[PDB]
Design a protein around this motif. Structure first.
Motif, PDB file in Angstrom:
ATOM      1  N   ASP B  51     -12.026 -10.273   4.441  1.00 30.42           N
ATOM      2  CA  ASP B  51     -10.967 -10.128   3.643  1.00 30.42           C
ATOM      3  C   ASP B  51     -11.231 -10.906   2.766  1.00 30.42           C
ATOM      4  O   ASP B  51     -10.700 -10.788   1.365  1.00 30.42           O
ATOM      5  CB  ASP B  51      -9.549 -10.260   4.446  1.00 30.42           C
ATOM      6  CG  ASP B  51      -8.466  -9.579   3.803  1.00 30.42           C
ATOM      7  OD1 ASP B  51      -8.496  -8.410   3.371  1.00 30.42           O
ATOM      8  OD2 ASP B  51      -7.261 -10.412   3.591  1.00 30.42           O
ATOM      9  N   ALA B 227      -1.169  -9.400  -0.273  1.00 35.65           N
ATOM     10  CA  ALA B 227      -2.136  -9.170   0.909  1.00 35.65           C
ATOM     11  C   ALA B 227      -2.752 -10.764   1.251  1.00 35.65           C
ATOM     12  O   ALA B 227      -2.768 -10.629   2.436  1.00 35.65           O
ATOM     13  CB  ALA B 227      -3.593  -8.573   0.167  1.00 35.65           C
ATOM     14  N   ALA B 259      -1.816   0.820  -1.932  1.00 36.67           N
ATOM     15  CA  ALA B 259      -2.717   0.389  -2.884  1.00 36.67           C
ATOM     16  C   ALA B 259      -3.649   1.534  -3.363  1.00 36.67           C
ATOM     17  O   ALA B 259      -4.032   1.621  -4.306  1.00 36.67           O
ATOM     18  CB  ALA B 259      -3.828  -0.761  -2.432  1.00 36.67           C
TER      19      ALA B 259
HETATM   20  C1  LIG Z   1      -3.213  -5.958   2.331  1.00 37.10           C
HETATM   21  N1  LIG Z   1      -4.689  -6.545   2.437  1.00 37.10           N
HETATM   22  C2  LIG Z   1      -5.440  -7.031   3.584  1.00 37.10           C
HETATM   23  C3  LIG Z   1      -5.212  -8.560   4.046  1.00 37.10           C
HETATM   24  O1  LIG Z   1      -5.483  -9.059   5.106  1.00 37.10           O
HETATM   25  C4  LIG Z   1      -5.261  -6.524   1.313  1.00 37.10           C
HETATM   26  C5  LIG Z   1      -6.662  -7.232   1.002  1.00 37.10           C
HETATM   27  C6  LIG Z   1      -7.227  -7.268  -0.076  1.00 37.10           C
HETATM   28  C7  LIG Z   1      -6.936  -6.275  -1.308  1.00 37.10           C
HETATM   29  C8  LIG Z   1      -7.342  -6.012  -2.660  1.00 37.10           C
HETATM   30  C9  LIG Z   1      -6.685  -5.202  -3.365  1.00 37.10           C
HETATM   31  C10 LIG Z   1      -6.933  -4.918  -4.533  1.00 37.10           C
HETATM   32  C11 LIG Z   1      -6.553  -3.684  -5.273  1.00 37.10           C
HETATM   33  C12 LIG Z   1      -5.329  -3.075  -4.918  1.00 37.10           C
HETATM   34  N2  LIG Z   1      -4.483  -2.392  -4.788  1.00 37.10           N
HETATM   35  C13 LIG Z   1      -7.072  -3.545  -6.838  1.00 37.10           C
HETATM   36  C14 LIG Z   1      -8.089  -4.196  -7.407  1.00 37.10           C
HETATM   37  C15 LIG Z   1      -8.612  -3.957  -8.853  1.00 37.10           C
HETATM   38  C16 LIG Z   1      -8.062  -3.011  -9.467  1.00 37.10           C
HETATM   39  C17 LIG Z   1      -8.519  -2.562 -10.657  1.00 37.10           C
HETATM   40  N3  LIG Z   1      -8.947  -2.553 -11.896  1.00 37.10           N
HETATM   41  C18 LIG Z   1      -6.904  -2.090  -9.099  1.00 37.10           C
HETATM   42  C19 LIG Z   1      -6.414  -2.634  -7.659  1.00 37.10           C
HETATM   43  S1  LIG Z   1      -5.260  -4.641  -2.373  1.00 37.10           S
HETATM   44  C20 LIG Z   1      -5.653  -5.570  -1.062  1.00 37.10           C
HETATM   45  C21 LIG Z   1      -4.899  -5.638   0.129  1.00 37.10           C
END
Ligand SMILES: CN(CCO)c1ccc2cc(/C=C(\C#N)c3ccc(C#N)cc3)sc2c1
Lengths: 122, 278, 107
Positions: B51, B227, B259
């Motif tokens: 992660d 996150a 997301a």
């Molecule tokens: C809840 N967790 C697990 C934690 O253990 C996570 C972990 C990583 C993560 C990364 C996320 C990223 C996006 C969303 N949404 C995103 C990135 C770039 C663009 C553009 N251009 C648009 C969107 S959301 C996310 C959630």
């Protein structure tokens, strides 16, 4: 290959007299250019006197000289004439003859692109 | 310009695809990690440092996307400024049009040659300005310029008639002037008005869509920091209870699917911006 | 009758000094304004036409600008052969020609 306008006939004259100024055009014919007479009093600015368009025969005069001057042209010998009558003290000046192109296009927008040498009237 | 806009949205779509691929890969790794139900510290410190990698890269991609979005906004602002300039030129042309109409009315109501001559002088100045007031090789453009050439020619004819004291011929020349104006410049005027109205509508809808897109990016950015907070409020605390764990295991699934809803909304908004821009 | 008011009536400048001459039209004459240069004892010659277009052969230091009924002639670098009387002239129609009073730029 030089476009030019030459004025002649001006000179000393008694008040109330009569004289025919001439503007001979070379390098271009009258039929596609209106010919304007513009005077400059000694030490004063420029003043438009009259014009003639030989293509349509239209002639117009300044208000200060309307009814006294008579502008005409002869395309056969490519010349313009200004008969000046009932001359007064304010008619003494240097008279220039200029060419102005016809609408439309650059010829009209260029205004008085070529001027004559001008002749003195006293 | 337009090619640059197409390249931007293209690359923004590509970044979107990369961040959805990274998210689904992270989800697959989390699923394969927690199907076995292993409480070993090494697996947690490693299969969640997964992660950590996803968030480090995805955040850099988000920064690049924000820069691209700012450039997109700047280009859209330049387009709006061009449209504003064109609308201003159209307003000037309509003002010249109104001057011509007013002086035509004056000529119709005139009685002597002086009033006709003054109105024709105003008409000639307005026609010259209107011919010059134009932003460009369409057939309608050429017909507009030629029609104003003929229109100033008819003004010349009317002025020539008026200078001879012929008032009625001046009114007749003004009527022929009206006919020529209608036959030549009206179509260009209608086309320009329609284009200006359509461009105002497009500007309004694009201001709305750009606002929605900026909101979607800021919302996604807020989810990403949530996150990280959730993972390390659970990572550094070396949690051990299975109930505390499971709860998080779902929190992240619901956050990841939210997301997803956000990322597909961004994709559809970008596709809309492309269609409306070509 | 269109008046074409020219200011200043006369200005004194040295070589290299930027020179600005302004003209006001009593009514809109479109861009149908020309700037003429006249030396003492010589006929006027055309410097600028259409209020912004430079006539062929004129040095590029001369320039013209329009803002509504205001017209501006600018000499960026006054050269020693630039002392003369400059006239703004509106040419909306053949019979409506009027000249400015003239600005006598002297070194
Ligand atoms: C809840 N967790 C697990 C934690 O253990 C996570 C972990 C990583 C993560 C990364 C996320 C990223 C996006 C969303 N949404 C995103 C990135 C770039 C663009 C553009 N251009 C648009 C969107 S959301 C996310 C959630």
């Amino acid at each position: 290959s030089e476009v030019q306008l030459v004025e002649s006939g001006g000179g000393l004259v008694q008040p109330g007299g009569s004289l025919r100024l001439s503007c001979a055009a070379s390098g271009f014919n009258v039929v596609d250019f209106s010919l304007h007479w513009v005077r400059q009093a000694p030490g004063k600015g420029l003043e438009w006197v009259a014009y003639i368009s030989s293509s349509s025969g239209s002639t117009s005069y300044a208000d200060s000289v309307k009814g006294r001057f008579t502008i005409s042209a002869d395309t056969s010998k490519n010349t313009a004439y200004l008969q000046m009558n009932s001359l007064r003290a304010e008619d003494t000046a240097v008279y220039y003859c200029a060419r102005w192109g016809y609408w439309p296009g650059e010829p009209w927008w260029k205004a008085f692109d070529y001027w004559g040498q001008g002749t003195l009237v006293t | 310009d337009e090619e640059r806009l197409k390249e931007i949205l293209f690359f923004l779509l590509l970044i979107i695809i990369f961040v959805v691929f990274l998210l689904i890969v992270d989800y697959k790794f989390l699923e394969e990690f927690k199907e076995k139900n292993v409480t070993d510290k090494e697996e947690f410190n490693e299969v969640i440092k997964i992660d950590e990698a996803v968030m480090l890269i995805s955040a850099f991609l988000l920064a690049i996307a924000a820069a691209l979005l700012k450039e997109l906004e700047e280009l859209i602002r330049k387009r709006f400024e061009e449209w504003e300039k064109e609308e201003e030129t159209l307003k000037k042309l309509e003002d010249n049009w109104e001057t011509l109409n007013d002086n035509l009315k004056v000529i119709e109501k005139a009685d002597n040659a002086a009033q006709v001559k003054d109105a024709l002088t105003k008409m000639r100045a307005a026609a010259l300005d209107a011919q010059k007031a134009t932003p460009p090789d369409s057939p309608e453009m050429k017909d507009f310029r030629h029609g104003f050439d003929i229109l100033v020619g008819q003004i010349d004819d009317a002025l020539k008639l008026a200078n001879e004291g012929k008032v009625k011929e001046a009114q007749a020349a003004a009527e022929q002037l009206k006919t020529t104006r209608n036959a030549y410049i009206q179509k260009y005027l209608e086309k320009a008005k329609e284009t200006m109205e359509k461009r105002k509508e497009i500007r309004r809808e694009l201001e709305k869509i750009l606002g929605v897109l900026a909101g979607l990016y800021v919302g996604a950015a807020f989810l990403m920091v949530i996150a990280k907070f959730l993972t390390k409020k659970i990572k550094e605390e070396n949690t051990t209870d299975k109930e505390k764990l499971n709860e998080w295991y779902e929190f992240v699934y619901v956050l990841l699917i939210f997301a997803f809803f956000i990322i597909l909304a961004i994709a559809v908004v970008l596709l809309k911006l492309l269609e409306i821009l070509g | 009758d269109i008046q074409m008011t020219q200011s200043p009536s006369s200005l004194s400048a040295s070589v290299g000094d930027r020179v600005t001459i302004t003209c006001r039209a009593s009514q809109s004459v479109s861009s149908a304004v020309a700037w003429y240069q006249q030396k003492p004892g010589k006929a006027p010659k055309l410097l600028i036409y259409s209020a912004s277009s430079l006539y062929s052969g004129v040095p590029s230091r001369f320039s013209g600008s329009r803002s509504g009924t205001d017209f501006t002639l600018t000499i960026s670098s006054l050269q020693p052969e630039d002392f003369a009387t400059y006239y703004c002239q509106q040419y909306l129609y053949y019979s409506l020609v009027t000249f400015g009073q003239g600005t006598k730029v002297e070194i």
